[PDB]
Amino acid sequence: SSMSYSWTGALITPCGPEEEKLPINPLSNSLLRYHNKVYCTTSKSASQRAKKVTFDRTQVLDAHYDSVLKDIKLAASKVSARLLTLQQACQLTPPHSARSKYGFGAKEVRSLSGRAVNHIKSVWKDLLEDPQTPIPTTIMAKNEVFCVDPAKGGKKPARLIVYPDLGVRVCEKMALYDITQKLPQAVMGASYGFQYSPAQRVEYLLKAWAEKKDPMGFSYDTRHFDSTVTERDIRTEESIYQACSLPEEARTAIHSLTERLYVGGPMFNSKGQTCGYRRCRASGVLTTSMGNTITCYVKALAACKAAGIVAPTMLVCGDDLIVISESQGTEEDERNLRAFTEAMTRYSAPPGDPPRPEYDLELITSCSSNVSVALGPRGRRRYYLTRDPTTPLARAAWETVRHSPINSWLGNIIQYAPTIWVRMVLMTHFFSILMVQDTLDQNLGGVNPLDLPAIIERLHGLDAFSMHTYSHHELTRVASALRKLGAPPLRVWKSRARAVRASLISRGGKAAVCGRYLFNWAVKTKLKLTPLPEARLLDLSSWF
RNA sequence: CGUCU
Ligand SMILES: *O[C@H]1[C@@H](O)[C@H](n2cnc3c(N)ncnc32)O[C@@H]1COP(=O)(O)OP(=O)(O)OC[C@@H](O)[C@@H](O)[C@@H](O)Cn1c2nc(=O)[nH]c(=O)c-2nc2cc(C)c(C)cc21
Ligand SMILES: Nc1nc2c(ncn2[C@@H]2O[C@H](COP(=O)(O)OP(=O)(O)O)[C@@H](O)[C@H]2O)c(=O)[nH]1
Ligand SMILES: [Mn+2]
Ligand SMILES: [Mn+2]
C-alpha cells in the first residue's frame, strides 16, 4: 500500500554551517579523554537516514483496535475545546522559531507586527476554504551529539525533521493548541506519561508493580515511529479530535490541516528544490507529540487485548511505552508478548528491539531511563530514576566555537541529581570548573549555581545528598561508561570531589552550602544534613 | 521543527 516517502534525489542540505571540534576542548579535556568518540550527526548522513525510513506500510486493524478506538472516541466526547485568537496563537510561537519565507520572523510574530498579523490572517483564510491542496513543507537534517558504538554501526544517521512555514505553525496553534492541552489527559488518564514528574513516575510504577499479585513488566517502542504512521492513522486521529465540542470554525481548519498538511505533502530542502513526498507523520507539527502519544495508546491497548495481557497498567510517553501486568506463568508470558508484537506489526507500528517480559523493575527501560535502588540515610530502600550515562557524558564533551556544554552539565546535574554518576562525576566537574573560572554564580539557563542544594531538595528531597549503596547494575554501568569515554574511574572522582568540597566550604557563604550538601558523600565523616528554608521558599514551578 | 516537564 502506502510508501512513507517518495524521493526526488535532491540532497537534504544543511541549513547553516556545521560545527567542527577544536584541537583543544578546554572545558571537558579533564572530564574525559576519548573525544574522537564524541560526534554530531551532520546533514551528510541525512542521505542515509532516508533509506532507513522509506518502506511500504500496510495495516490490518481488527475488532480489538476498533473496540479501543470506539471508547477513546467516547473519552473525546467529554472534552470541550476552543479556538485560539490569532493573537494568542502568535504569542505561543517560540522566540527563536524559524522565520517565514514571506519576510518576517519570530520577533515580529510575537510583538504582533502588522506585516505578520496580516499574512497569518490570510493563511488562516486559505485554511478555511481550500481543504485539498497540500501545504509545502521543509525537510531538515537534525544535528545531535552521541558517542560512537561500534556494536551498532558506529555513527547514527541524522534524524529527519519536517515542518511547514511559520504562517502555518501559528494557524495550527489556533485550530489545535487548546485540544492538545486537554485531549490526551482525557483519553488516557493515568496512562498519560508526560503528566508525571520524575519522582511521580517512580511512585507510579512502584504502585503499579505492587498492585499485582505476580507482576510482570515490559517496555515496547516502535522503530521509526514517524514513518509507521499511515494516512488512515492520521485521519483516524482527526476522527478523535473532531469528537470534542468544537466551534465550527475549528472543525473546518482542522479538517483542512489534516488533508493539506498532516497526511502528507511535498518536501523541500533548505536550498529550495523538491525533495520528496511524505505519506506519514511529519514530525515537527503541533500534533506530533500528541498524535504520536494517542495513536500509540490505541495500537498498544488494542494489542494488549489481542495478546491477552491481564490487568495491564500502562504508561505512554509518545511512542515509548511500558506495561506492568499480571504474570501468566513464564511460558505463557513469553507467548503473549509475541502476540503483542504480532498485533503491533499488523497495526503498522513494528518494534525495534523485540520486547521481553521482565520480573524485576530495574530491567524495564522507557523514555531512555530506568528505575534503580539505593540506600537512604536511615537505611531504607530509596527508588530513583537513572539512565545510561553514555550520551550525557558525550554531550558534556561537545565543545565548538558556537556551542558550550556547561548547560548540558547543569541540565543533567538537576534532572538526575540522585544518580551516582551525576553526584560523583558531573557535580564534581561542574564546580571544579566554575571555581577556577570564578564564575560560580552566573545565570545559566535561568538558574543560579549556588542555589543547587535548595533546588535539589525541592525536587528530589534531602535523600539525594545521603544515598549510598548503589545497585549492582547501576555501578557496572557507570564504571563501564566512564571507561568507554576515557574519563577517570569513580575512585578518582572521589578524590577530585574531596578537594572541590574543600574549596567550596572554605569559600563560605552560599558556596560552603554546596560543598557540604552536594559532596557529603565524599568525606570520611559525614555531616547530618537538615532541611533548608528554601524547600518551600523556592517557587516549585519555573519549569515544573 | 514541534510538544512537554
Ligand atoms: O542539554 C540541554 C538541557 O539539559 C537544558 N535544557 C534544554 N531544554 C530544556 C527543557 N525543556 N527542560 C530542561 N532542561 C532543558 O539545556 C541544554 C540545552 O541547551 P543547549 O546548550 O543545547 O542549546 P544552546 O547552546 O543553543 O542554548 C543554551 C541553552 O542552555 C539556553 O537556551 C537555555 O535557555 C536552555 N533552557 C531552556 N531553553 C529553552 O529554549 N526552553 C526552555 O524551556 C529551557 N528550559 C531550561 C531549563 C533549565 C533548568 C535549564 C538549565 C536550561 C533551560
Ligand atoms: N519533531 C521532533 N520529533 C521527535 C524528536 N524526537 C522524537 N520525536 C518524535 O517521536 C517519535 C519517537 O521516536 P524515537 O523513539 O526518538 O526514535 P524512532 O522511533 O527510531 O524514530 C519520532 O518518530 C518523532 O515523530 C525530535 O527531536 N523532534
Ligand atoms: Mn522509537
Ligand atoms: Mn521512543
Side-chain angles (χ1 to χ4, degrees), chain A residues 467-487:
Chain A
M467 287 202 321
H468 56 87
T469 315
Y470 277 92
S471 104
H472 172 64
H473 273 67
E474 174 71 348
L475 291 190
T476 317
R477 178 169 43 187
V478 165
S480 152
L482 297 144
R483 190 151 44 249
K484 167 178 20 191
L485 278 163

PDB file of all heavy atoms in Angstrom, chain A residues 467-487:
ATOM      1  N   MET A 467      22.481   9.307  49.780  1.00  0.00           N
ATOM      2  CA  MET A 467      22.218   7.991  49.207  1.00  0.00           C
ATOM      3  C   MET A 467      23.516   7.261  48.924  1.00  0.00           C
ATOM      4  O   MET A 467      24.443   7.835  48.351  1.00  0.00           O
ATOM      5  CB  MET A 467      21.426   8.114  47.922  1.00  0.00           C
ATOM      6  CG  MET A 467      20.023   8.475  48.171  1.00  0.00           C
ATOM      7  SD  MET A 467      19.066   7.985  46.765  1.00  0.00           S
ATOM      8  CE  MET A 467      20.172   8.406  45.429  1.00  0.00           C
ATOM      9  N   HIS A 468      23.582   5.983  49.295  1.00  0.00           N
ATOM     10  CA  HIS A 468      24.938   5.472  49.391  1.00  0.00           C
ATOM     11  C   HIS A 468      25.215   4.101  48.798  1.00  0.00           C
ATOM     12  O   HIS A 468      26.211   3.952  48.076  1.00  0.00           O
ATOM     13  CB  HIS A 468      25.382   5.499  50.847  1.00  0.00           C
ATOM     14  CG  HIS A 468      24.478   4.757  51.769  1.00  0.00           C
ATOM     15  ND1 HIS A 468      24.615   3.407  52.012  1.00  0.00           N
ATOM     16  CD2 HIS A 468      23.439   5.179  52.525  1.00  0.00           C
ATOM     17  CE1 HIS A 468      23.694   3.029  52.881  1.00  0.00           C
ATOM     18  NE2 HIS A 468      22.967   4.084  53.207  1.00  0.00           N
ATOM     19  N   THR A 469      24.434   3.075  49.093  1.00  0.00           N
ATOM     20  CA  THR A 469      24.721   1.834  48.390  1.00  0.00           C
ATOM     21  C   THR A 469      24.011   1.909  47.054  1.00  0.00           C
ATOM     22  O   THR A 469      22.850   2.303  47.005  1.00  0.00           O
ATOM     23  CB  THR A 469      24.275   0.597  49.160  1.00  0.00           C
ATOM     24  OG1 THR A 469      24.646   0.705  50.541  1.00  0.00           O
ATOM     25  CG2 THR A 469      24.950  -0.613  48.556  1.00  0.00           C
ATOM     26  N   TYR A 470      24.708   1.603  45.968  1.00  0.00           N
ATOM     27  CA  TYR A 470      24.092   1.713  44.653  1.00  0.00           C
ATOM     28  C   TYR A 470      23.974   0.346  43.995  1.00  0.00           C
ATOM     29  O   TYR A 470      24.804  -0.543  44.204  1.00  0.00           O
ATOM     30  CB  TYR A 470      24.862   2.676  43.753  1.00  0.00           C
ATOM     31  CG  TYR A 470      24.466   4.105  43.994  1.00  0.00           C
ATOM     32  CD1 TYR A 470      25.148   4.898  44.905  1.00  0.00           C
ATOM     33  CD2 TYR A 470      23.388   4.659  43.336  1.00  0.00           C
ATOM     34  CE1 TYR A 470      24.765   6.209  45.146  1.00  0.00           C
ATOM     35  CE2 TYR A 470      23.008   5.970  43.568  1.00  0.00           C
ATOM     36  CZ  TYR A 470      23.698   6.733  44.470  1.00  0.00           C
ATOM     37  OH  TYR A 470      23.313   8.024  44.690  1.00  0.00           O
ATOM     38  N   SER A 471      22.921   0.184  43.203  1.00  0.00           N
ATOM     39  CA  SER A 471      22.588  -1.145  42.720  1.00  0.00           C
ATOM     40  C   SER A 471      23.701  -1.678  41.821  1.00  0.00           C
ATOM     41  O   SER A 471      24.441  -0.917  41.196  1.00  0.00           O
ATOM     42  CB  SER A 471      21.252  -1.111  41.981  1.00  0.00           C
ATOM     43  OG  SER A 471      21.434  -1.163  40.585  1.00  0.00           O
ATOM     44  N   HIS A 472      23.824  -3.005  41.771  1.00  0.00           N
ATOM     45  CA  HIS A 472      24.920  -3.605  41.020  1.00  0.00           C
ATOM     46  C   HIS A 472      24.902  -3.166  39.565  1.00  0.00           C
ATOM     47  O   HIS A 472      25.919  -2.726  39.030  1.00  0.00           O
ATOM     48  CB  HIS A 472      24.864  -5.119  41.108  1.00  0.00           C
ATOM     49  CG  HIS A 472      25.838  -5.797  40.200  1.00  0.00           C
ATOM     50  ND1 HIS A 472      27.200  -5.671  40.347  1.00  0.00           N
ATOM     51  CD2 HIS A 472      25.653  -6.606  39.135  1.00  0.00           C
ATOM     52  CE1 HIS A 472      27.813  -6.376  39.412  1.00  0.00           C
ATOM     53  NE2 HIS A 472      26.896  -6.954  38.664  1.00  0.00           N
ATOM     54  N   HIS A 473      23.751  -3.278  38.906  1.00  0.00           N
ATOM     55  CA  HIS A 473      23.635  -2.809  37.527  1.00  0.00           C
ATOM     56  C   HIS A 473      24.165  -1.399  37.365  1.00  0.00           C
ATOM     57  O   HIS A 473      24.975  -1.118  36.474  1.00  0.00           O
ATOM     58  CB  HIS A 473      22.178  -2.847  37.086  1.00  0.00           C
ATOM     59  CG  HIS A 473      21.773  -4.162  36.532  1.00  0.00           C
ATOM     60  ND1 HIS A 473      21.715  -5.300  37.307  1.00  0.00           N
ATOM     61  CD2 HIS A 473      21.459  -4.537  35.272  1.00  0.00           C
ATOM     62  CE1 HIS A 473      21.357  -6.321  36.547  1.00  0.00           C
ATOM     63  NE2 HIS A 473      21.195  -5.884  35.310  1.00  0.00           N
ATOM     64  N   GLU A 474      23.678  -0.493  38.214  1.00  0.00           N
ATOM     65  CA  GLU A 474      23.988   0.919  38.087  1.00  0.00           C
ATOM     66  C   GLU A 474      25.472   1.170  38.289  1.00  0.00           C
ATOM     67  O   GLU A 474      26.062   2.005  37.589  1.00  0.00           O
ATOM     68  CB  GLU A 474      23.137   1.705  39.078  1.00  0.00           C
ATOM     69  CG  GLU A 474      23.447   3.175  39.150  1.00  0.00           C
ATOM     70  CD  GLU A 474      23.017   3.962  37.916  1.00  0.00           C
ATOM     71  OE1 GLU A 474      22.673   3.345  36.875  1.00  0.00           O
ATOM     72  OE2 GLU A 474      23.035   5.216  38.013  1.00  0.00           O
ATOM     73  N   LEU A 475      26.108   0.425  39.194  1.00  0.00           N
ATOM     74  CA  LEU A 475      27.553   0.552  39.351  1.00  0.00           C
ATOM     75  C   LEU A 475      28.268   0.107  38.086  1.00  0.00           C
ATOM     76  O   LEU A 475      28.971   0.892  37.452  1.00  0.00           O
ATOM     77  CB  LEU A 475      28.039  -0.242  40.565  1.00  0.00           C
ATOM     78  CG  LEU A 475      27.605   0.331  41.918  1.00  0.00           C
ATOM     79  CD1 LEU A 475      28.313  -0.338  43.070  1.00  0.00           C
ATOM     80  CD2 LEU A 475      27.835   1.796  41.965  1.00  0.00           C
ATOM     81  N   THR A 476      28.073  -1.152  37.687  1.00  0.00           N
ATOM     82  CA  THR A 476      28.716  -1.677  36.483  1.00  0.00           C
ATOM     83  C   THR A 476      28.488  -0.765  35.284  1.00  0.00           C
ATOM     84  O   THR A 476      29.369  -0.629  34.430  1.00  0.00           O
ATOM     85  CB  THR A 476      28.200  -3.098  36.173  1.00  0.00           C
ATOM     86  OG1 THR A 476      28.131  -3.868  37.376  1.00  0.00           O
ATOM     87  CG2 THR A 476      29.124  -3.829  35.208  1.00  0.00           C
ATOM     88  N   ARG A 477      27.328  -0.115  35.206  1.00  0.00           N
ATOM     89  CA  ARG A 477      27.068   0.707  34.037  1.00  0.00           C
ATOM     90  C   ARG A 477      27.877   1.993  34.100  1.00  0.00           C
ATOM     91  O   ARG A 477      28.564   2.354  33.137  1.00  0.00           O
ATOM     92  CB  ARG A 477      25.579   1.009  33.909  1.00  0.00           C
ATOM     93  CG  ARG A 477      25.259   1.916  32.712  1.00  0.00           C
ATOM     94  CD  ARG A 477      23.757   2.004  32.419  1.00  0.00           C
ATOM     95  NE  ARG A 477      22.978   2.147  33.639  1.00  0.00           N
ATOM     96  CZ  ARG A 477      21.655   2.104  33.694  1.00  0.00           C
ATOM     97  NH1 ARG A 477      20.923   2.017  32.597  1.00  0.00           N
ATOM     98  NH2 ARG A 477      21.054   2.130  34.884  1.00  0.00           N
ATOM     99  N   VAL A 478      27.813   2.694  35.235  1.00  0.00           N
ATOM    100  CA  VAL A 478      28.576   3.929  35.398  1.00  0.00           C
ATOM    101  C   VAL A 478      30.069   3.663  35.201  1.00  0.00           C
ATOM    102  O   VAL A 478      30.734   4.332  34.406  1.00  0.00           O
ATOM    103  CB  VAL A 478      28.272   4.558  36.771  1.00  0.00           C
ATOM    104  CG1 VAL A 478      29.285   5.608  37.124  1.00  0.00           C
ATOM    105  CG2 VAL A 478      26.885   5.160  36.762  1.00  0.00           C
ATOM    106  N   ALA A 479      30.604   2.663  35.908  1.00  0.00           N
ATOM    107  CA  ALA A 479      32.006   2.269  35.769  1.00  0.00           C
ATOM    108  C   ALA A 479      32.376   2.085  34.320  1.00  0.00           C
ATOM    109  O   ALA A 479      33.404   2.578  33.846  1.00  0.00           O
ATOM    110  CB  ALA A 479      32.256   0.958  36.519  1.00  0.00           C
ATOM    111  N   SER A 480      31.541   1.361  33.607  1.00  0.00           N
ATOM    112  CA  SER A 480      31.856   0.995  32.248  1.00  0.00           C
ATOM    113  C   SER A 480      31.623   2.163  31.302  1.00  0.00           C
ATOM    114  O   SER A 480      32.261   2.249  30.254  1.00  0.00           O
ATOM    115  CB  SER A 480      31.030  -0.247  31.882  1.00  0.00           C
ATOM    116  OG  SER A 480      30.761  -0.324  30.502  1.00  0.00           O
ATOM    117  N   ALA A 481      30.731   3.081  31.647  1.00  0.00           N
ATOM    118  CA  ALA A 481      30.504   4.193  30.741  1.00  0.00           C
ATOM    119  C   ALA A 481      31.688   5.146  30.772  1.00  0.00           C
ATOM    120  O   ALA A 481      32.124   5.639  29.722  1.00  0.00           O
ATOM    121  CB  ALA A 481      29.202   4.901  31.103  1.00  0.00           C
ATOM    122  N   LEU A 482      32.219   5.412  31.978  1.00  0.00           N
ATOM    123  CA  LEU A 482      33.433   6.212  32.131  1.00  0.00           C
ATOM    124  C   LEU A 482      34.593   5.568  31.394  1.00  0.00           C
ATOM    125  O   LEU A 482      35.302   6.227  30.625  1.00  0.00           O
ATOM    126  CB  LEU A 482      33.769   6.370  33.610  1.00  0.00           C
ATOM    127  CG  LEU A 482      32.724   7.108  34.425  1.00  0.00           C
ATOM    128  CD1 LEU A 482      32.624   6.506  35.797  1.00  0.00           C
ATOM    129  CD2 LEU A 482      33.105   8.562  34.521  1.00  0.00           C
ATOM    130  N   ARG A 483      34.789   4.266  31.614  1.00  0.00           N
ATOM    131  CA  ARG A 483      35.807   3.525  30.884  1.00  0.00           C
ATOM    132  C   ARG A 483      35.680   3.747  29.380  1.00  0.00           C
ATOM    133  O   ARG A 483      36.667   4.044  28.710  1.00  0.00           O
ATOM    134  CB  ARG A 483      35.712   2.042  31.249  1.00  0.00           C
ATOM    135  CG  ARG A 483      36.870   1.192  30.752  1.00  0.00           C
ATOM    136  CD  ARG A 483      37.145  -0.013  31.651  1.00  0.00           C
ATOM    137  NE  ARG A 483      35.917  -0.703  32.045  1.00  0.00           N
ATOM    138  CZ  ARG A 483      35.424  -0.726  33.281  1.00  0.00           C
ATOM    139  NH1 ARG A 483      36.068  -0.153  34.296  1.00  0.00           N
ATOM    140  NH2 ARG A 483      34.253  -1.337  33.507  1.00  0.00           N
ATOM    141  N   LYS A 484      34.459   3.661  28.841  1.00  0.00           N
ATOM    142  CA  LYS A 484      34.257   3.760  27.398  1.00  0.00           C
ATOM    143  C   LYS A 484      34.681   5.117  26.855  1.00  0.00           C
ATOM    144  O   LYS A 484      35.057   5.226  25.682  1.00  0.00           O
ATOM    145  CB  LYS A 484      32.788   3.490  27.062  1.00  0.00           C
ATOM    146  CG  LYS A 484      32.372   3.873  25.633  1.00  0.00           C
ATOM    147  CD  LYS A 484      30.902   3.543  25.315  1.00  0.00           C
ATOM    148  CE  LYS A 484      30.062   3.384  26.579  1.00  0.00           C
ATOM    149  NZ  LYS A 484      28.705   2.821  26.315  1.00  0.00           N
ATOM    150  N   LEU A 485      34.654   6.156  27.688  1.00  0.00           N
ATOM    151  CA  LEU A 485      34.827   7.520  27.218  1.00  0.00           C
ATOM    152  C   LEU A 485      36.136   8.162  27.656  1.00  0.00           C
ATOM    153  O   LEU A 485      36.386   9.321  27.307  1.00  0.00           O
ATOM    154  CB  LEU A 485      33.637   8.373  27.669  1.00  0.00           C
ATOM    155  CG  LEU A 485      32.433   8.217  26.743  1.00  0.00           C
ATOM    156  CD1 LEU A 485      31.175   8.708  27.406  1.00  0.00           C
ATOM    157  CD2 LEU A 485      32.675   8.963  25.451  1.00  0.00           C
ATOM    158  N   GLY A 486      36.990   7.446  28.381  1.00  0.00           N
ATOM    159  CA  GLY A 486      38.284   7.971  28.767  1.00  0.00           C
ATOM    160  C   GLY A 486      38.311   8.680  30.097  1.00  0.00           C
ATOM    161  O   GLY A 486      39.395   9.015  30.588  1.00  0.00           O
ATOM    162  N   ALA A 487      37.158   8.916  30.688  1.00  0.00           N
ATOM    163  CA  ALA A 487      37.070   9.610  31.944  1.00  0.00           C
ATOM    164  C   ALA A 487      37.729   8.790  33.050  1.00  0.00           C
ATOM    165  O   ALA A 487      37.850   7.563  32.939  1.00  0.00           O
ATOM    166  CB  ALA A 487      35.609   9.863  32.275  1.00  0.00           C
TER     167      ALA A 487
END
